[PDB]
Amino acid sequence: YAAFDTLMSTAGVDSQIAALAASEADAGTLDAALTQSLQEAQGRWGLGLHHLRHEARLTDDGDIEILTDGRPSARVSEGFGALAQAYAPMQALDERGLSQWAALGEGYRAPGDLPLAQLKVLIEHARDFETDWSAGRGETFQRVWRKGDTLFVEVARPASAEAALSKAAWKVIASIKDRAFQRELMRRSEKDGMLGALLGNLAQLPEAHFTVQAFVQTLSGAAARNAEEYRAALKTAAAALEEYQGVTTRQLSEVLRH
Amino acid sequence: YAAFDTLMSTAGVDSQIAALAASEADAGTLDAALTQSLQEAQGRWGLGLHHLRHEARLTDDGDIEILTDGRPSARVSEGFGALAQAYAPMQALDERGLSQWAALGEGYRAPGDLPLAQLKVLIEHARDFETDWSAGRGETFQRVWRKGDTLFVEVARPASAEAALSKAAWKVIASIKDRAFQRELMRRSEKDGMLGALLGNLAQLPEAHFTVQAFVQTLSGAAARNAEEYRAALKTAAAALEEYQGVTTRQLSEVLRH
Amino acid sequence: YAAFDTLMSTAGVDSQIAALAASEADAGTLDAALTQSLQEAQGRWGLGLHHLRHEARLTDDGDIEILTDGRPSARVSEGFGALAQAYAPMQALDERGLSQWAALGEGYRAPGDLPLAQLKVLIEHARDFETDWSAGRGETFQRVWRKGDTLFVEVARPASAEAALSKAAWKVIASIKDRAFQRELMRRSEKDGMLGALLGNLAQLPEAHFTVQAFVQTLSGAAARNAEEYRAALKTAAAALEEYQGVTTRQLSEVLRH
Amino acid sequence: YAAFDTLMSTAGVDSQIAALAASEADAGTLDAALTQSLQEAQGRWGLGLHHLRHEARLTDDGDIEILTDGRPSARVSEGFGALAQAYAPMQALDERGLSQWAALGEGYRAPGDLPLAQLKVLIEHARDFETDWSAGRGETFQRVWRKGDTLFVEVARPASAEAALSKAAWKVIASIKDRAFQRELMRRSEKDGMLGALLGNLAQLPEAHFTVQAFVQTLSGAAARNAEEYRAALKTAAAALEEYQGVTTRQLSEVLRH
Amino acid sequence: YAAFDTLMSTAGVDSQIAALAASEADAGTLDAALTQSLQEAQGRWGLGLHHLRHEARLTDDGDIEILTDGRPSARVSEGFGALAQAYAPMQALDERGLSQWAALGEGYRAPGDLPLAQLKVLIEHARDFETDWSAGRGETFQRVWRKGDTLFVEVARPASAEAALSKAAWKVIASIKDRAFQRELMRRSEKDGMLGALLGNLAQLPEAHFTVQAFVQTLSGAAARNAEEYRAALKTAAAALEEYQGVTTRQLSEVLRH
Amino acid sequence: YAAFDTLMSTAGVDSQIAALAASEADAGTLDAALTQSLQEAQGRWGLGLHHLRHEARLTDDGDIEILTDGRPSARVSEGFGALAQAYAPMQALDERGLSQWAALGEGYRAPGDLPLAQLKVLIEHARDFETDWSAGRGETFQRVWRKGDTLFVEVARPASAEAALSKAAWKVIASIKDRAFQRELMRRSEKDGMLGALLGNLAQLPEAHFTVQAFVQTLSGAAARNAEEYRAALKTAAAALEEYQGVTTRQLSEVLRH
């Protein structure tokens, strides 16, 4: 039970599965809680599998199996690296790291070249619409889509799990006041890299497979159609991304320090 | 067989059912031909039943029954007035004569107050969208919607079947060179009306129940997304409306002349 | 003019209106001829509107309007079905099809349970008297009343216009020597009925609204008081009913044969 | 006022006009009381003027005028002999003293030769019927008629006012115990009569012009149709006749005694 | 007996029959007294029946019968109106009210146009002579005749009994000091007359049938031939007329006053 | 340093590297100790890589790299599974699990079908000779070869590391006195197997990659040529195999018990 919490902790989703499993809750409630957390985790992982139906259920074998559009991909006790090697073939990333898949599925997708003027009309007067990726604030990207009575905004800053481990390794290496040890790690970083130099291991760690690369902000009802509030969710998602991406680089520095 | 042709002739649709029934065609082909003609007729009648699934099939009793969303409404041998009293309760007309129903069904409908600027975006970048009624060229109205990969434009000039019989009665009455008989019909028109004066009967005539009030122009593929060609179909539908509405007022003058 | 003749032909009354209209007769004579024929027709139709003052007059609009106790009910050019839907609310039929109205109006009505002994006294010694309905010869009924110096006898065999069309349809269907076509009409008669099977239309036909259901035999002077001659008019009315009802079922078979 | 009471006292009708005139009642009430009493008096006088509309009204000249079908006949202050000479020409008596007029007016009248069997039918099943005169119990006569919802029975024993004065004169003359005076009146009765002998004068007396010759018993509602109760009113009228005719011969003996 | 006194009191003749009947006088004396009084009454009544032999006799029936030239006219107990209707057909009055009959009978009658000079010769030297009517003093008339040794002078002022009742009614009506009641009787006199207004009845009164209209003064012996004394009897008769006619209008005012 | 001891402990070779690294010994001595232990371990692992020159040396990066015929295969800190996936492609196992490679290399190899008579001659009179695999005592196999002045005997009982983990799992599962839990593990063993049932993980354990499958007994000098002593080393190697294979199945039961 605690392994799924650490697997859901790499996306900013507090599942409380270890507390819900001990809460003596029925299987119908446990399955719904584990399913609603992996969906909020898949939206923060940047996998771009929104077109897939993510689900989770506990097996009678004493394990938890992941579900994707009907077919089982992997199990919980099979390690955090087995699930990453299962959703990777179902994911298509471009040269920037974004998902080329459309969240709505088969249909039309407006390009990222569309001005903000034509977007307010598709937010106030349209039914179903999906946009591609466009350059956001700073070095980030953003995409929007609306399905049914719910509007979704996914501001993303692509960053792989390996690149995330190398960034946190250079932060703890630069914070070394000992100039002799800081030079020794800088000499080994020229060949093995920033990660292999600080270590002179983390294959079972969940942070080495899934990282935070996007944020999903939702809106339903009449707010999902007002163009003024849509401009307030893109900043609420870009700020929830800077805080989430700023907290994972700090939790990773507390582990590689040893 | 010939009754369905006259019933389809009041909407500008040449069904050729009397030629197809004598063509020794199978029932599968006869049902498809009668179904594709009533759909093109319902779109030219102005009933606004586009949200309903119109169908037609020949019965083993030797008759033809009309179909609407599964439930049979009326039969062909039951007269052209029985079908009009069946689709009227399923139709909702405002004070102008237009259908308040949305062609797409449940969802959002952009109002007729939207400028043409926000419409090109919903034609070039949107998936499913439907508009309400707006004032068109002259004294006409227009509405547009797109379902799947097909875009539909329905320019409409509301005119009931009774108002159509009264207009054709004043045209033949004004064309009377005999000033004495023209004055006599004008004296009886002050009470009985323009129709009851020329007649001093047409309950079994199909033109007294269904009239032309709109035109349906369709486009599929990439043409259903280009905003330049969408501006060419609205005029192709408004011209196909002036010609169709101009030919029904002439065929009605050739009958009331007797 | 010819429409009122066919409307008066369904009751065995030869009005000769088409010959009287062309006879260049004044309006006073034309109104009296059309009025005396509808009264003799209403007495043979079984409507039981004898308590109402039936009248008819030609309108200056080129039409003929029916009159009943002062208020206009319908017009001639309004079809033979409009007049039937107008006199029906003024008619009250029991479970047998007879008129519950008293021909004399407000007063006393002797029941049909009265013997023939007490009737001769009311025929020879009474002034105004009216009887209710009693079972006549065969499956018929009979009623008698006397107003002023005129005695009236109305032998009736109730039969609606729809039941009359179904009886004539089974006679032409039984006369089919072709056993294959006779079986085909018998197979469709199990659901649509005897009328809908022979037809695989007659809404404008006058025979589909008014049928012969009674006969009115009158007597005035001293003959309207002799009990011996009153027994001779009831048979003269029951025989004039079998012949009239036997001729309408033959004229209806000559139309449905096509 | 008191003269109309004595004029109404010769028919067994207590009018109480002298008490009603002093009762300070309006003219509308006084006219109705005097009218309802002369009608009940005319029915007991045997005049047979039931076909005439009897009425009475007080004149502004201080007198009371009699009314019959609209035209004034006589006045009250003109003596009781003037009214008798006015209704006599409007009365037609046969050789027996009965009124040949029919109470119902123009129409049919069943003869007195009709058995009681055919009468119960005309009482239970008929509307309006009137009978002629037939020999009743003893030396009396009887006639019946029904108008509207009221049945009337008039048992009559014809007796003129002059014959009534001669009968009461022989009763007081036979009651004379003095054989000498009884013989003297019998000797003068051989020429002058029974009346002129007892007197050796009464022209102003109301009893010398109007006498009781019939009785009117009425019934309304459902009782006016039951044959069992009709047999109870004929005896209630024949007994009310023997008592009324037996009391007038006693009041006349109390006057001629002087 | 007292009825003949009141019948003789309307002519100024005091018969005293009620005193003579109680005087136990024989029938021969009673007949002579009643005969001599009716003759003096007929001469004062103005009936002009002097040519008739007036007589009166009491009947054994207890009544008194009037006699005129042998044939009985009426009886006393038959009322004072029966005798007036009996002597009227035997009387012939002109337009002035005088009797056209000659008192002497068949013969010659000198006209009223004769001067007084030729009259003295017919009074002093003639035997039997009779004059017609001539205008007397004032508005009166006079006539003279002589039969045997008796000369008769009849000064007359014609006045019917009805006109006498109307004159006495205007005298009591004019003597009304109450101006309101005098106006009320004057308002009813415009239609009913002066008699019917004061009464708002007197058919049995003798004054309503016989009135004083002449006076008979007689002379016999040598005085019936002296012309000087004949001029003294005409004034003695004209004065006995003004007093008698002046006393009847006073006795009539004492009766109508009630 | 301690990881290479656990990596050398799965072959019955006590390297004492953690004690030699802390012994402050030079790199020349540390490299020789780590090299002589992996060679004695590769001979007990059954890999059949005797034809390859196995070597080991500590890297200046703080790690230990494995060496095989000159080319580096893997490193020590790369896990015990990386080295197993490196020597597997250099190993060729038949259907029984034995190495098809000849220990001497290119040359001739006497088959296992050779009798023991012809083997004593090749042990007492030959120089270089190598034998293939032949069925040994029980279910084991054996092979012999001599290179230079040293004779080698390798008695082998093929058993993969996965089959070794499944055997130790059935021993701890059969030793369960709790019959309910023993039945539950037997129910899950029908599908997941004996290993997956006891666990309801050991990827980083060295015992899950390298197991004991053979024993290498050596002899040099004149003893490497006496046929009597060669028969004493094959039993000294088959007994050193039963003890080594009997001690690894006991150390594996002490780990899977948790």
Side-chain angles (χ1 to χ4, degrees), chain C residues 197 200-201 203 206 208 214 218 220-227 229 232-233 237-240 246:
Chain C
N201 301 18
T218 58
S220 66
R225 199 157 293 271
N226 183 20
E229 194 149 348

Side-chain angles (χ1 to χ4, degrees), chain D residues 10-12 14-16 18-19 21-23 25-29 31-33 35 37 41 43 45-46 48 51 56 59-63 67 70 72 74 77 79 81-82 84 86 88-89 92 94 97 99-103 105 107-108 110-113 115 117 124-126 128 131-136 138 140 145-146 148 150 156 158-161 163-164 166 168-169 174-175 177-178 180 182-183 189-191 193 196-197 200-201 203 206 208:
Chain D
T10 179
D14 187 11
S15 56
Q16 291 290 339
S23 179
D26 54 321
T29 301
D31 296 0
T35 307
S37 298
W45 277 330
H51 59 282
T59 70
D60 297 357
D61 199 15
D63 201 356
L67 199 276
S77 66
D94 53 357
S99 180
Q100 293 174 317
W101 300 114
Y108 183 88
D113 197 18
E124 292 186 347
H125 302 299
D128 288 359
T131 63
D132 211 333
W133 291 104
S134 53
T140 66
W145 71 88
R146 175 172 54 182
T150 56
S160 59
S166 180
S175 68
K177 300 299 177 299
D178 199 325
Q182 184 183 26
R183 190 215 328 272
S189 64
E190 304 174 4
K191 182 181 181 300
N201 301 18

Side-chain angles (χ1 to χ4, degrees), chain A residues 61-63 77 196 200-201, chain F residues 61-63 77 196 200-201:
Chain A
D61 199 15
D63 201 356
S77 66
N201 301 18
Chain F
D61 199 15
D63 201 356
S77 66
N201 301 18

Side-chain angles (χ1 to χ4, degrees), chain E residues 2-3 5 10-12 14-16 18-19 21-23 25-29 31-33 35 37 41 43 45-46 48 51 56 59-63 67 70 72 74 77 79 81-82 84 86 88-89 92 94 97 99-103 105 107-108 110-113 115 117 124-126 128 131-136 138 140 145-146 148 150 156 158-161 163-164 166 168-169 174-175 177-178 180 182-183 189-191 193 196-197 200-201 203 206 208 214 218 220-227 229 232-233 237-240 246 248-249 253 257-258:
Chain E
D5 290 324
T10 179
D14 187 11
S15 56
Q16 291 290 339
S23 179
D26 54 321
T29 301
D31 296 0
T35 307
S37 298
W45 277 330
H51 59 282
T59 70
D60 297 357
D61 199 15
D63 201 356
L67 199 276
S77 66
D94 53 357
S99 180
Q100 293 174 317
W101 300 114
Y108 183 88
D113 197 18
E124 292 186 347
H125 302 299
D128 288 359
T131 63
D132 211 333
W133 291 104
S134 53
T140 66
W145 71 88
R146 175 172 54 182
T150 56
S160 59
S166 180
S175 68
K177 300 299 177 299
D178 199 325
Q182 184 183 26
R183 190 215 328 272
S189 64
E190 304 174 4
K191 182 181 181 300
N201 301 18
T218 58
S220 66
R225 199 157 293 271
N226 183 20
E229 194 149 348
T248 54
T249 180
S253 294
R257 172 174 43 89
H258 300 341

Side-chain angles (χ1 to χ4, degrees), chain F residues 77 79 81-82 84 86 88-89 92 94 97 99-103 105 107-108 110-113 115 117:
Chain F
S77 66
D94 53 357
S99 180
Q100 293 174 317
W101 300 114
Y108 183 88
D113 197 18

Side-chain angles (χ1 to χ4, degrees), chain A residues 156 158-161 163-164 166 168-169 174-175 177-178 180 182-183 189-191 193:
Chain A
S160 59
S166 180
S175 68
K177 300 299 177 299
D178 199 325
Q182 184 183 26
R183 190 215 328 272
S189 64
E190 304 174 4
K191 182 181 181 300

Side-chain angles (χ1 to χ4, degrees), chain A residues 108 124-125 128 225, chain B residues 108 124-125 128 225:
Chain A
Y108 183 88
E124 292 186 347
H125 302 299
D128 288 359
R225 199 157 293 271
Chain B
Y108 183 88
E124 292 186 347
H125 302 299
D128 288 359
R225 199 157 293 271

